[PDB]
Scaffold this active site. Sequence first.
Site, PDB file in Angstrom:
ATOM      1  N   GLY A   8      11.037   2.103  -8.893  1.00  0.00           N
ATOM      2  CA  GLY A   8      11.328   3.392  -8.286  1.00  0.00           C
ATOM      3  C   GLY A   8      10.089   4.253  -8.175  1.00  0.00           C
ATOM      4  O   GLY A   8      10.007   5.083  -7.287  1.00  0.00           O
ATOM      5  N   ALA A   9       9.127   4.094  -9.084  1.00  0.00           N
ATOM      6  CA  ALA A   9       7.996   5.049  -9.136  1.00  0.00           C
ATOM      7  C   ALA A   9       6.659   4.333  -9.031  1.00  0.00           C
ATOM      8  O   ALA A   9       5.659   4.997  -8.735  1.00  0.00           O
ATOM      9  CB  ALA A   9       8.005   5.915 -10.417  1.00  0.00           C
ATOM     10  N   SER A  10       6.609   3.029  -9.319  1.00  0.00           N
ATOM     11  CA  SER A  10       5.333   2.259  -9.077  1.00  0.00           C
ATOM     12  C   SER A  10       5.683   0.875  -8.525  1.00  0.00           C
ATOM     13  O   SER A  10       6.873   0.431  -8.548  1.00  0.00           O
ATOM     14  CB  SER A  10       4.470   2.143 -10.354  1.00  0.00           C
ATOM     15  OG  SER A  10       5.085   1.237 -11.266  1.00  0.00           O
ATOM     16  N   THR A  11       4.689   0.209  -7.958  1.00  0.00           N
ATOM     17  CA  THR A  11       4.865  -1.195  -7.548  1.00  0.00           C
ATOM     18  C   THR A  11       3.710  -2.052  -8.101  1.00  0.00           C
ATOM     19  O   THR A  11       2.551  -1.563  -8.139  1.00  0.00           O
ATOM     20  CB  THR A  11       5.099  -1.333  -6.023  1.00  0.00           C
ATOM     21  OG1 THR A  11       5.601  -2.655  -5.693  1.00  0.00           O
ATOM     22  CG2 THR A  11       3.830  -1.181  -5.259  1.00  0.00           C
ATOM     23  N   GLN A  12       4.026  -3.287  -8.553  1.00  0.00           N
ATOM     24  CA  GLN A  12       3.035  -4.202  -9.137  1.00  0.00           C
ATOM     25  C   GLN A  12       2.891  -5.463  -8.299  1.00  0.00           C
ATOM     26  O   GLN A  12       3.878  -5.979  -7.748  1.00  0.00           O
ATOM     27  CB  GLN A  12       3.398  -4.584 -10.587  1.00  0.00           C
ATOM     28  CG  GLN A  12       3.283  -3.405 -11.593  1.00  0.00           C
ATOM     29  CD  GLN A  12       4.404  -2.386 -11.395  1.00  0.00           C
ATOM     30  OE1 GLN A  12       4.127  -1.215 -11.099  1.00  0.00           O
ATOM     31  NE2 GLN A  12       5.660  -2.821 -11.499  1.00  0.00           N
ATOM     32  N   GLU A  26       3.044  -4.042 -17.346  1.00  0.00           N
ATOM     33  CA  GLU A  26       4.266  -4.165 -16.597  1.00  0.00           C
ATOM     34  C   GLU A  26       4.140  -5.288 -15.569  1.00  0.00           C
ATOM     35  O   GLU A  26       5.076  -6.082 -15.373  1.00  0.00           O
ATOM     36  CB  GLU A  26       4.464  -2.803 -15.887  1.00  0.00           C
ATOM     37  CG  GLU A  26       5.779  -2.696 -15.153  1.00  0.00           C
ATOM     38  CD  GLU A  26       5.991  -1.277 -14.649  1.00  0.00           C
ATOM     39  OE1 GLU A  26       5.069  -0.426 -14.825  1.00  0.00           O
ATOM     40  OE2 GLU A  26       7.051  -1.012 -14.042  1.00  0.00           O
TER      41      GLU A  26
HETATM   42  O1  LIG Z   1      21.279  -2.040  -7.045  1.00  0.00           O
HETATM   43  C1  LIG Z   1      20.275  -1.352  -6.845  1.00  0.00           C
HETATM   44  C2  LIG Z   1      19.672  -0.815  -7.983  1.00  0.00           C
HETATM   45  C3  LIG Z   1      18.521  -0.054  -7.801  1.00  0.00           C
HETATM   46  N1  LIG Z   1      18.079   0.214  -6.554  1.00  0.00           N
HETATM   47  C4  LIG Z   1      16.878   1.057  -6.329  1.00  0.00           C
HETATM   48  O2  LIG Z   1      15.705   0.210  -6.250  1.00  0.00           O
HETATM   49  C5  LIG Z   1      14.564   0.914  -6.798  1.00  0.00           C
HETATM   50  C6  LIG Z   1      13.920   0.073  -7.876  1.00  0.00           C
HETATM   51  O3  LIG Z   1      14.845  -0.028  -8.944  1.00  0.00           O
HETATM   52  P1  LIG Z   1      14.373  -0.524 -10.401  1.00  0.00           P
HETATM   53  O4  LIG Z   1      15.554  -0.343 -11.338  1.00  0.00           O
HETATM   54  O5  LIG Z   1      13.624  -1.840 -10.293  1.00  0.00           O
HETATM   55  O6  LIG Z   1      13.283   0.650 -10.684  1.00  0.00           O
HETATM   56  P2  LIG Z   1      12.930   1.321 -12.136  1.00  0.00           P
HETATM   57  O7  LIG Z   1      13.963   2.442 -12.246  1.00  0.00           O
HETATM   58  O8  LIG Z   1      12.882   0.174 -13.188  1.00  0.00           O
HETATM   59  N2  LIG Z   1      11.462   2.282 -11.704  1.00  0.00           N
HETATM   60  P3  LIG Z   1       9.938   1.903 -12.341  1.00  0.00           P
HETATM   61  O9  LIG Z   1       9.977   0.412 -12.573  1.00  0.00           O
HETATM   62  O10 LIG Z   1       9.833   2.688 -13.673  1.00  0.00           O
HETATM   63  O11 LIG Z   1       8.932   2.466 -11.388  1.00  0.00           O
HETATM   64  C7  LIG Z   1      15.052   2.234  -7.363  1.00  0.00           C
HETATM   65  O12 LIG Z   1      14.636   3.263  -6.430  1.00  0.00           O
HETATM   66  C8  LIG Z   1      16.591   2.080  -7.443  1.00  0.00           C
HETATM   67  O13 LIG Z   1      17.248   3.281  -7.032  1.00  0.00           O
HETATM   68  C9  LIG Z   1      18.735  -0.325  -5.409  1.00  0.00           C
HETATM   69  O14 LIG Z   1      18.236  -0.098  -4.273  1.00  0.00           O
HETATM   70  N3  LIG Z   1      19.830  -1.107  -5.571  1.00  0.00           N
HETATM   71 CA   LIG Z   2      11.114  -1.312 -13.350  1.00  0.00          CA
END
Ligand SMILES: O=c1ccn([C@@H]2O[C@H](COP(=O)(O)OP(=O)(O)NP(=O)(O)O)[C@@H](O)[C@H]2O)c(=O)[nH]1
Ligand SMILES: [Ca+2]
Length: 420
Positions: A169-173, A130
């Site tokens: 939402g659940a991890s950071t890279q 990822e």
């Molecule tokens: O417009 C937006 C869309 C998403 N978000 C939030 O940012 C965070 C990161 O969104 P993302 O779509 O990049 O995360 P992801 O669901 O792909 N999660 P992961 O990559 O599986 O860990 C989330 O908590 C989402 O609720 C906003 O703050 N504004």
């Molecule tokens: Ca993502």
Amino acid sequence: PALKYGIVLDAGSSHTSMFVYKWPADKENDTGIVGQHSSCDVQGGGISSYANDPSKAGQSLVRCLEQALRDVPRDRHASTPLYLGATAGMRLLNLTSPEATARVLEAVTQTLTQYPFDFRGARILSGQDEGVFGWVTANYLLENFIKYGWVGRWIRPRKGTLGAMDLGGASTQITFETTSPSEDPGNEVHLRLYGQHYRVYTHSFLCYGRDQILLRLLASALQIHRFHPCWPKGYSTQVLLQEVYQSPCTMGQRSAIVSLSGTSNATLCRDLVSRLFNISSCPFSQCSFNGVFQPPVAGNFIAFSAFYYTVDFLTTVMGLPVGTLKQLEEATEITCNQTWTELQARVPGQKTRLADYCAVAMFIHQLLSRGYHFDERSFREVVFQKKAADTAVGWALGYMLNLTNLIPADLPGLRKGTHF
Ligand SMILES: O=c1ccn([C@@H]2O[C@H](COP(=O)(O)OP(=O)(O)NP(=O)(O)O)[C@@H](O)[C@H]2O)c(=O)[nH]1
Ligand SMILES: [Ca+2]
């Protein structure tokens, strides 16, 4: 100008998005040639949110897959590859129940196989995948892999590449090219792209995504304070404790419902966030945090996903500069000190996420400065953007490039050995 297409469903912890990419048939191994043609946001949660109702995971994709039949011309359906890659929502579900994980993967697979695209599989990406694939997306789109100069006068050192920071939402890279010696095999990446060797560092911090951090800070506020110092004064909500503690990320922090209110305390909020980062031990020559190896940050970086959304809030809604680490810290303090009526006065429309900006901004400030060890000099090289050349930045393009084999290891005929 004959075109080919390809499709990726990015099945993240919080959402699924579909990206359709297009490229000219006979220039297809050129760097930066593939671009986004269209995309679709699937309504509702991520595929892992259907852990206990796996068939709804497959059904959630239908609307976006119906848009793909309209986006890609019909005579190209049969030969347009389609992939699904899932990230830390599914990695966390896999720790809890590999069986429920399998049933979700089975349901999306069943759905995707009924469509006329060339379906190439549903997979869970590793953390390394990822991080590397978003680094490849950003650098491919900004043409950082071109060898700049001409015969007799090549630019030296070669063109720098952009580091990538992805706050999901659940991890950071965090992923970036480095000259430092490797100390941990799990962080070490070697790529061969258009004849060149890239030595790369990557790390994925599971449970350090935005939604999981908010859940951990809430668990922690509940245990330590019984008020939430990061929430704005005047804001309160009924917290369902079973939801707070069911995550693998918060199980280690353990009445069905408690009322919890904000207090706009920037200093206590900062204290609360600081406990997320264990800085006490390093078995390597140097670490980021939690004992993880990390060489010094270097070069430019693009910070996308929730880094961008949160910085966009601070600059566009709060009207505050974030050009330096000290401005980002001041902006976080001002935001955290706002009462709930004051924050709402700034946001005439929908208020979702509004009570969380303080906590997220604070985590991002600490992650960059305390976790990754950016300072004012390296931070100046960071840009917050979510799009490059009309294509969303994420891992989906890099993933598609790799599985479709569209980036050659070497140039054709090695370009007559002219880059040796
Ligand atoms: O417009 C937006 C869309 C998403 N978000 C939030 O940012 C965070 C990161 O969104 P993302 O779509 O990049 O995360 P992801 O669901 O792909 N999660 P992961 O990559 O599986 O860990 C989330 O908590 C989402 O609720 C906003 O703050 N504004
Ligand atoms: Ca993502």
